[PDB]
Write a structure and sequence with these properties.
This is part of a larger assembly, with four copies of chain A. Chain A is built from nine helices and 13 strands. The first copy, chain A, is an alpha/beta fold. The termini of chain A are far apart. Chains in contact: A-B, A-C, A-D, B-C, C-D. At the B-C interface, helix 7 of B face strand 8, strand 9 and helix 6 of C. Chains B, C: It is an enzyme of class 2 (transferase).
Chain lengths: 307, 311, 311, 307
């Protein structure tokens, strides 16, 4: 008998009729709803048109890095650009459409920080659904005051300045526009700029320069975007190409190699995009390196802004 | 001067080299990882092959109902089947790809329960990103001990028993497959489905009156590749029942009617509906980019389901 | 000897080097450009969230009506919603990809008003390219102070209120999205729509009798990915109203009947139609590659709308 | 009360019944309409089968150049070939499906010439809809006596003569034919020839040679067509490839580099096609360089024909 406790919910003391006939919403006008949404979105577009940190790709590595950066420095404008409608990338499932998420120690310390429960198996731990990890990190990241998630939005190119570096921003559009198609062309893009420039477009050496962190995963549909674009622009930079699966070497190397990119200033990488760029092994259905590679890139970025 | 505070993270005291050269994972072999995942998934398939509550569609209405049911009764096996890889349905955005989520009072009381922050505007409140609502409910629902999310899995039919107790259609489970299989035009066919059964039957397949019968709650919305799935399937089988068909947009009438009409379906026993699927079934107005009725319609269906299991 | 005249252009007196090496733009930063565009677009979305006239479809009939309405009443908020990136509909060509545009008299009087040149052939006149007609009307309409063109945006439903004043369907606005979203099979769903409201309602959503009610004019043609949109949606909601269905081609009867039948729709209040959508709704003949009825049907609808707003 | 002025339109004094029952068209026969259209189209195909200026692509740069050329020299046969049904290219919208069109000074002088209204913001001006710019230029260009717009028509190749140059015309088809597909093949093309040749196909050195201006935008679906084709034919000519976004450098360089192409005689370029050919930066949602690069190419072409 547990079936004898009371049925309780948020309206239990206000809705008294069995048929809910005494339920009512406060009244509304359709234009009030429209203006409430549009006003807030334009405020976001105005505020983040110059950003301190631009993160490309809201998968496990990008969101892990966003958490660490924003928690440490709540004053910094952190702009997260995600091409899909749903954020989270490949972290809604384990392998072969199965659920469980394996993370090798010491990645369990990140789970403890986020208060995510797990089963301890000795050298590794298991979160009972990959979806529990990614939804928890999302809930926490999005609550922060200067974080913005621009979902359904795709990076199409980089904003640059002349040689020796730099990146100076990203070129953006609705994903469905970029993926179009048969429709009348053109449909021009928008731009988001990094902190550090004057109104005449030149560098202000007195101001701390913004950074880009690319975490778009390995090569594919929208995959390894910033790695390929840097390699395309620069003749002496070549794409390593992701190698075969080897869990010991892949997870180690992805964590170690994450962070600042050597050939371009103010440019950072984490997650499987690093494996494409640097020619590292893949790891398949294990997730500790994705979280911890985000942690490593976040440390390097935070040190840049500390001065 | 926030820039003077320490750079700290979960590995700050164990990783001491600037270049992270002293970082190390514990060792592993590939088969250990495979077996860790497969063993747990087939334990889920075994355990939930008979379920107490089957929820079809993990959108705002379905997940809101899952929260209320599971929190109230942690003993019941609650099986959530979602066709997409990412759960959440239409709740990752507001309208026209914009972000803010408007909820009319008294839906703010549900946000207070979930500890979701909002801006109070008088007769309504605003959550700063729709994604904050849906990820918060997901995080809380999935932590519960007898809840399972079968994502990338679709419902393609109902399991039934013969007419009346009372009504034409009598529900006893759902017919399932990987979503990509159901959508697979047109490789070698067939690829047969699997089945998940409701509580209440003997090993010979007949009703066991000493057990409380399980229930289905369908929350598949009004549209998409599927959408209004269980509404259309009941209407198809039962020749004396037709789809009302969703009408034009009218927020005052839509939100009221969707909340009130949610719950038990008359004509089929042990069958419940919430969210925009109710508007398709009962011929109600739509509401567009406002979300209070989705959450509160899930709450109403959950109340009726919880009362079924109380006695 | 035209080849002896001077080569002159807008920069002839300021750019003096043969190689243009002394040419210079004023300096700029990328965020200045972004903010200049976004600030203006959200001002449009705020201002037109309540509109006096909503015109659905920017083809020859819709733009002709827009011209007459806005020129007569420059105070009214006229909101033009067009699904394609380029406005103009079927008026960029004549028939079979050929160019010339034939207009039967007295449609030449509309061309005279717009100062569009033509060849007089007696009972009809010819504009040398259909593209000259449509680009001229566009240039003039868009200059007007309270006209807004929302291109790349589609209407996917009607905003309604409950039956009779009098008739089954009562219009109060339109439901909108980016065209590419509405057509998006089959990414994560939902992606919710937005709404644009007609003048005449209080903040509690009820009719305000002290204000003139806004109107919708649908001019979406007979075909295409959408097409005859509002005709089909009214017919779908109202079970006692059916589509006439467009008949065979007959120029004498089609052009006459389309002009006369344009204007207020009986059965729905504050709802108007023009162009080939009228032929679908009322079961009229088609006319093919002749354009006088498209322009003049817009003029007739505009007269009826202007009379509504006069008192 | 503005609602008290009269309701007036072009038929107000001729249509007297409230129900429009006294409205009538002059009568017609279906074959009269058909013959009116076909006769005029064949006259165009006959007249422009030899042309003085062939402009490929009716976007902002191509139409701006057409305006300047035709206004200065109304005697020259200017043949505009556009693959889409609607001309205008990417100039129906600003960026990210938004409307406003930003043009940096001194591009405002071109707007003044065309009588297009704008908001002055100091170093730049704003046209309230990109659609107002492009429809105004279209209306004015099309009224000119020796200009022809062949829309729904695609350039598939160049007509050439043997090495040292030249281009001698273009190879054309309906766009839907070129894009086909599964249908029976072949469907052969047509040709449009440049002024300057004799009836035996050889150069007439006494006559002024026609020119091609290619303005097909940057690489894509139908993008950068003539740039790629020249590079394909010539082994020692390579495609620069468009670089990252940088508004200061892109707009300057696109204007300066527009005009005559160095490796081929009687060949000219403007707009974003120049950025692909010469490896220049892109500029995104700003439009001054498109108009003014058209102006520069027009100056060079007009000087060729002045003799």
């Amino acid at each position: 008998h547990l079936n004898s406790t009371p049925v309780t919910h948020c309206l239990s003391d206000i809705v008294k009729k069995e048929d809910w006939s005494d339920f009512k919403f406060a009244p509304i006008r359709e234009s009030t709803v429209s203006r409430a949404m549009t006003s807030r979105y334009f405020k976001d577009l105005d505020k983040f048109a110059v950003s301190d940190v631009i993160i490309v790709g809201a998968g496990s590595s990008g969101l892990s890095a966003a958490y660490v950066i924003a928690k440490n420095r709540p004053d910094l404008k952190v702009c997260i650009i995600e091409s899909s409608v749903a954020p989270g990338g490949g972290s809604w499932l384990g392998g072969q459409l199965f659920s469980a998420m394996v993370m090798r120690k010491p990645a369990h310390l990140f789970l403890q920080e986020l208060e995510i429960p797990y089963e301890d198996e000795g050298d590794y731990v298991v979160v009972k659904h990959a979806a529990l990890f990614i939804s928890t990190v999302l809930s926490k990241v999005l609550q922060l005051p200067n974080v913005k998630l621009f979902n359904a939005t795709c990076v199409e190119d980089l904003v640059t300045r002349p040689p020796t570096v730099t990146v100076a921003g990203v070129v953006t559009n609705w994903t469905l526009v970029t993926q179009a198609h048969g429709t009348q062309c053109s449909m021009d893009p928008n731009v988001i700029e990094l902190a550090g420039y004057k109104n005449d477009g030149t560098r202000d050496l007195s101001q701390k320069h913004g950074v880009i962190l690319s975490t778009t995963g390995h090569d594919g549909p929208f995959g390894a975007f910033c790695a390929k674009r840097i390699v395309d622009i620069d003749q002496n930079q070549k794409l390593g190409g992701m190698k075969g699966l080897d869990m010991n070497h892949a997870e180690h190397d992805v964590v170690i190699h994450s962070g600042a990119y050597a050939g371009v200033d103010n440019m950072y990488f984490a997650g499987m995009e690093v494996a494409e760029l640097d020619g590292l092994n893949r790891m398949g259905p294990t997730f500790g390196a994705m979280a911890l590679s985000g942690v490593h890139a976040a440390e390097q970025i935070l040190k840049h802004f500390a001065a």
